[PDB]
């Protein structure tokens, strides 16, 4: 199930589940937290931009949230977890199965009731502890004493008594004693919500059947009585604005305030959340501002105000509605189509089964906005024909999308189902756009393709006709009539030359766009079901009927790969930028990476919910996915844009259980010498040998053109004074007798002693192994140094050393650096004794070795003498 | 194909921030304006990173294990990079002007001084993958009363010292239980901190003040507290300190003042070690290897990038580089080095793999208006608005001559006969063509006919006509050699603005002011082609432009152009936003890219943002200079109309994204395009695309690998380039044995022939089998000499790389080679006695 | 401490320098400087390095002793005793003083005759080329190899780290030999800024 | 950083970068009250007619 070339990154475009939200105060400012599934998004109130989302990923669905300053409580299965600034900092685990249901923080006590009427209870292990941590008791009502448990709630000035609420009636528990100090009336009617009133010792309760109650506890009376027939109280919210205000949440979306102290009714907000969904599932004033926010099932989160009264005199009596002031959204049902909408990843396009299309952001999610589908005036003046009552437009089957002519006119189409024309839209301006493309052969829409420059439109008719229209006008231009089946893909190359179509006949037709001239024909075994065509490559990929990705290449038009493992059908897959990978889902929950170079499954994942699309991000960076169930998109990180990743074939049958190196990492490593006979030169940077021979007049620029002014009074040995590193000839230490020129035994230096040692040995390969490894001025210190007094053993001994390098044929430039070094300090040396048998001899056998490295200069000689030739005449 | 990506960028290598060596001591990280650039002095190689801020970098750093880069624009937006990977990891907004960030030297931690909060956050690792959120808050400290200047960090990674605009440096300890080893305020300094450094037994703690005061802090009896017990005094008459750098273990303190000139003294006995002057510009930033004997010092205004060995008294790297200067740019016929020309009036050589100009040229007076090399290569001619076009010799770098107009004309472009003996020049101001004759100087022949200004000249490398275009729509053809002169004008609908000819020498394209790039035949001088470029072409909205970006007509046009060698590409800039090539035979637009994204630069929007007006108006277009605290910052030398041609002060508005030049490389597949930040140079020598030829099912990294085992080398190497791998084809090219190495080649089919030598062309110049590549290029050449020569355009880059190749690292090899024969032979041979 | 705080080979070579006892012969030149330097020379002994001092006016030398009761340092008594041999053999104080403070200082010592055997003139003439007109050539030397070098006689000192006496040591043999002039002073610019470098 | 002089001219308040405050006598030139540790900078002060001393 774990990738290893993707990983989850994060839900976009998700607001709010269902779950109520809680409301936290940090100072003066306030923040929402907002369950999604199995993580939680904190959202500021005052511009409701996303600060925080949890680390991780919860094992179970979260069920209750309550926040409380900078920490937050998220209560999943029988685990409460603890949570500051996104960062789980400490685990409250419960010692039953049964699954905690409600959540209340007092003080230092933490209360959890579990969905078997027994309520646990949390406590600080020290004062001033940040969080309860340590376990206190446990308090569990039984039948006899009342019904389910509705919400755990705390009322003000109770010192250490919990008001438990239940459908039969309400319960105060001291915690701290655990003992039940008071029960309530009996309530006819089944209770949904509790919520505590800014007045004292009165609570206000919520009943299945259209009834809300200001019990006061502290008397055990009934205090008022609210009714709002044939209705289901969800949410309830006092105004602490300084009027006496109360928001009532139906079941059916509609949002109701009232007028405690007059015994009216200031407003009613209508369908504010769909009903279907849920309706007004959390509804909550803002402690001592004007401000009421509302979520729901439906992926929405919104706020309403309430704006000063117009009358100068008797404003309470005068009251304005509250006003729509700001919200964040999402689709209501799992996104059916998706498609990067930019070369980089900032914008995103979704369309659902909610007859509504989206552009979301990735890199921030307020950018997120909606295409408005209000329609442009038609250019004959004739009136437009539909339904008076404004309804979305069908679902989105198919979609392109194309940036060549960006803000100038049109450039993405959309097909709808069961529509015999395909809409089109613009991005810059976030609006549909003011053409409409007809299929002309009776026939519904079934593929949508746009040229890269963005002038032409391609429609595929579901009776095998392809229709080509132009952006800019909307005119139809031609009509290609080839397959006599529905036509599922459509593409043009990047040079607008050559053009491909595919159809449920199983046919592949190659057409000159240009010329309009069919180029050739191609027939494959089963119908053919959906295409992807990579531009930079000429490569383009059908997801055939008999559960196959052929990979066909247009230039040649012949079958290039043949993909075959999956189990079922093919939903969706995509190439990768580069034209290296194809990703593929399928209906048996699984996602295929695979390897087009070798023809097989580098990487297989197993997700609970089947992938209904796949979308590489232009760039690489990031994989988009769609899954049938979850309102938002999963966004996964390559990672294989961080490191290598293995190319050898997945195991099929280990899959299905839980249902050479050089080639597997695509790359290759030069050898150090092909062959012994083979000149070579040394691995590393080619200036060293330029470096090495005119290291003098290197350097003579590179000082300054005016003296450093020094002080007077410096330390002789500062370099050597210095506080512990480096690595200088100069910063070199002896290593362990008669005084010798070389050195004293002892205390010669490293290169001396191998030099000896590679003379006595007759094999200087160390010494020659140490040569390469000095810098360059560590280089020309020891040639200098060499000993060039009588009998001449050093110098002797140093052209043995780079005659049997020769001999290796490897690094012979810096041993021929090296020979030319050795006559730069001691030419004068060798000259004057050119008769003595030792260096006469020596250098004999380095000319003998030498001679022989000539071919070079014929080769080098020659190619010149072709590649001036060739290249000129 | 067109495949381009951004590689790196020439022409400026540092514009602002802090420069910082890497830990190893062998890669150099330089700010340069909106991109990172680092350079490896050792290998000599450098490239610029492709992640790209909104505004210019204000901070930098890198951890030591060399995984992790955080750059800090002056926003606050951080970006941080993985190193060895090239890629962004993340981004974040600290919501403040960060001052400077430095990386823990344990690697944990890192610390930003943001106003007047220290914030230390936790490093993300490298290893795990990217997450929402991958860095996780330690802790904010809040302690000083205005901004933070620098921080520096405790070798061991516990205490961090900060020092701020309050007069005042503090210590902090990162741990919160050694909280009561280090919380003490220091204080005495009359002006700003510096900085702030812990000696290596960190027994002692050193503060410098920009007023040029060290204080050596010890923790002694007056019952034990910290004490000022020496006072060191900077005796600068004017000048200020402005950046401060301490290497605890050498006891370097290298100190850059503001009036240009640095000095390092060796503390605690305060012993001058060196001062030096760089230039009258102030000493922006210091930086010290981690081994104490490399200083990087950097000078914004000239943009200058110094690296000295104080130890011995030389440099490692002396550079200047060019903001908004860049006029124009020539490749050298091999591709080894591209010239650039500055209204400074200085030429510089730039070698690409390492970075660094090679070479200046001072003997223009005024602005550099355009550069074009002979076809020979040795020789370079330079056409100035002083009024002269100058002659270099690169042999000698010598101006071997000089030639002037003798009405005393400016030029604007200039044109050089593939002989390299005639020289033509064109004017803005006399509506002629001059022409010289490069052996003696003489001025040949005015060639007249133009009813408007000279835009743009070219020859013709064949047939060697010239053309000439200018602002009369019209274009002419001068077939000045010859026994006859003929003149053949061709007609255009708008003015002509650049102008570039075909290799073949048969065609010429022109871009118009219309927006147009239209192809025409010279021999026939009819239309071949057009292609349209206004809808192409992004142009933003201009700060201080009163009219939108779609409306406005500023720049919809293409004022410069070239072929790709081949011949069937172009690519056009304009001064606009936008790099675009297109392809001539279809005329369609192979791809485009975006210039620049910064929004110093004035054109890289196209909207802009409505929060920044009020009444007044733009917020940006009010001049806050007055705000900054020193005087040279708050002081106008600007002239009111000045457009161009004078230092950024003068002309007091923003820079505006521009590019002057294009060229494809003669030698590989890139180009260059000189713009105001430099010179974007975009490659395609990645190739991580899968762009395979002519495949079958057959075909398959394995089969080939058995292709070859099975000794089938012919097939092998075929299946290879099928494929179009460079790692398969690199296996199977070292793996043929040198005995079958002719045979294979007269066997290689003619369609790959092209395929294989661009890459022995790409592979041998950074190779060590010499021989071995030798040894192909004598097999193909000999067997395949007369197919390439029938078609040269097609292989033309390779051929150039191929010789590039054997005259830069075989023909220096053997050189070595032979001379020593030489000087050996001359030792034995002769006689040496007394 | 602050609050901040983090939590016997001989240098000499060629001569045998070597509770423990070392003692150092003075010859009688360097008397009258050891005893108007005397004040100076055993603070940095008894104090930084612990250790016990006398010099036996019989036998006119300079005896030292590890005390087991404050010595620390094992072998502050072999670094003391190469400090005073320093000094005996011809060296000024502040450098002596400088094997103390470093720990990568070293004295090589040769003899005219272990090069090559001269006499009369001939070693005159030897002595000479190493010095040269006002010392210049041993000026030369001193700063470009970065040494101190003392040349008494035909006996020759010198003072510095590994690398840096090496060069000083070949350059004299040079001298000696009878090499012209200007591989002397022509390659001594060259190991001056070679040492110097970073590569 | 900032002075304030009273009606009367009498009194004077001065704040400094050390954060100390110091009332001074201006008709005799004694220094009468010097607040020397404040919990940070006083950047200005302010007298007003009745005699009320205002830090910010
Ligand atoms: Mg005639």
Redesign the interface.
Known sequence: KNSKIFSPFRIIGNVSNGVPFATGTLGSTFYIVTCVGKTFQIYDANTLHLLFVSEKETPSSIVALSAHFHYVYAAYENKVGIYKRGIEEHLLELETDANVEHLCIFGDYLCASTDDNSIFIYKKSDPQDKYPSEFYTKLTVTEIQGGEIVSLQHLATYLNKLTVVTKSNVLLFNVRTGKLVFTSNEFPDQITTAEPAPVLDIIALGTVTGEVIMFNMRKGKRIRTIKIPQSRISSLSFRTDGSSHLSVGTSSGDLIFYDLDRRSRIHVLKNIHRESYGGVTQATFLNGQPIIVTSGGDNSLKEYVFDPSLSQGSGDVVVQPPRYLRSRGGHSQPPSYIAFADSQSHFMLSASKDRSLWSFSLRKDAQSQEMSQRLHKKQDGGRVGGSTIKSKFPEIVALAIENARIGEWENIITAHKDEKFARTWDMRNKRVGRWTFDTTDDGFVKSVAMSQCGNFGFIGSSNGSITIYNMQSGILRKKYKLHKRAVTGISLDGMNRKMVSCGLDGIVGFYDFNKSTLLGKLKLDAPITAMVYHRSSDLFALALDDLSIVVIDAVTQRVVRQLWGHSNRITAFDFSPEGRWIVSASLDSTIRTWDLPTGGCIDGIIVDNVATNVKFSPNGDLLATTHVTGNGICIWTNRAQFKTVSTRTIDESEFARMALNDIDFNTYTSLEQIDKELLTLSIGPRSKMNTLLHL?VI?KRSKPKEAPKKSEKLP??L???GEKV?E???????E?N??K?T??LG?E?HFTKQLREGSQSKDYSSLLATLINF???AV??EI??LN??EPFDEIVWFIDALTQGLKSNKNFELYETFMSLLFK?HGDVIHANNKNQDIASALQNWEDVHKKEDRLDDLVKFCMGVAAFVTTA | KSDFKFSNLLGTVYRQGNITFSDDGKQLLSPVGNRVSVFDL?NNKSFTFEYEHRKNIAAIDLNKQGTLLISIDEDGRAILVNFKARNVLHHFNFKEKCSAVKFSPDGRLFALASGRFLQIWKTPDVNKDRQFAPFVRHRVHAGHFQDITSLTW???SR?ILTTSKDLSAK?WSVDSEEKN??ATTFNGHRDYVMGAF?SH?????YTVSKDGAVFVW??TKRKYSWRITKKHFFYANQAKVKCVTFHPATRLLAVGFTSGEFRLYDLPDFTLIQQLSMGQNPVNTVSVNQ?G??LAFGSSKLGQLLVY?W????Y?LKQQGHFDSTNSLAYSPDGSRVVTASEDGKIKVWDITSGFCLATFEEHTSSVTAVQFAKRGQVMFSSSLDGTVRAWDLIRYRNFRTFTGTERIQFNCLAVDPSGEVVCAGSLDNFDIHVWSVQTGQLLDALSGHEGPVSCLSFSQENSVLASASWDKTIRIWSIFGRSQQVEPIEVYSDVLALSMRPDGKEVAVSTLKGQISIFNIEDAKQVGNIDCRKDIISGRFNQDRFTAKNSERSKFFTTIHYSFDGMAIVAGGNNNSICLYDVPNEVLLKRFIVSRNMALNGTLEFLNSKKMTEAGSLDLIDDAGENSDLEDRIDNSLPGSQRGGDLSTRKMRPEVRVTSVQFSPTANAFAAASTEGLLIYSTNDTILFDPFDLDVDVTPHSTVEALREKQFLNALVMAFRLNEEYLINKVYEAIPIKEIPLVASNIPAIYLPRILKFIGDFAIESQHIEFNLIWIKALLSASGGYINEHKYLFSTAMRSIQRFIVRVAKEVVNTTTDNKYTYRFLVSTDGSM | ???????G?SRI??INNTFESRKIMVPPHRMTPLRNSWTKIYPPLVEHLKLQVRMNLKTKSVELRTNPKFTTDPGALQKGADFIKAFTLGFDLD?SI?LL??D???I?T??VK??KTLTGDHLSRAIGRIAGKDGKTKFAIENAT?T?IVLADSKIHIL?????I??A??SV??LI?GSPPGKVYG?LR??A??????? | NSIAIDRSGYYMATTGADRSMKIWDIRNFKQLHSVESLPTPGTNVSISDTGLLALS
């Open positions: 003098d350097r002789f040995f370099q050597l004074s480096r200088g000839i100069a910063h070199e230490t002896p362990e008669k005084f020129v050195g004293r205390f230096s810098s360059p001025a020309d210190l200098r140094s060039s007094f300090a | 050792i405790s070798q061991d205490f210590i080893l280090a812990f037994d960190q027994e002692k703690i010890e923790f081994t004997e490399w060995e130890q011995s008294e030389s490692i | 401490v602050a609050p901040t705080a983090l939590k080979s070579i060629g450098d400088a403070r470093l990568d200082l070293y090589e040769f003899e272990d090069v970065r101190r510095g780290g590994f690398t840096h090496r060069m040591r070949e043999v040079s030999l390659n060259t190991v800024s070679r040492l110097k470098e970073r590569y």
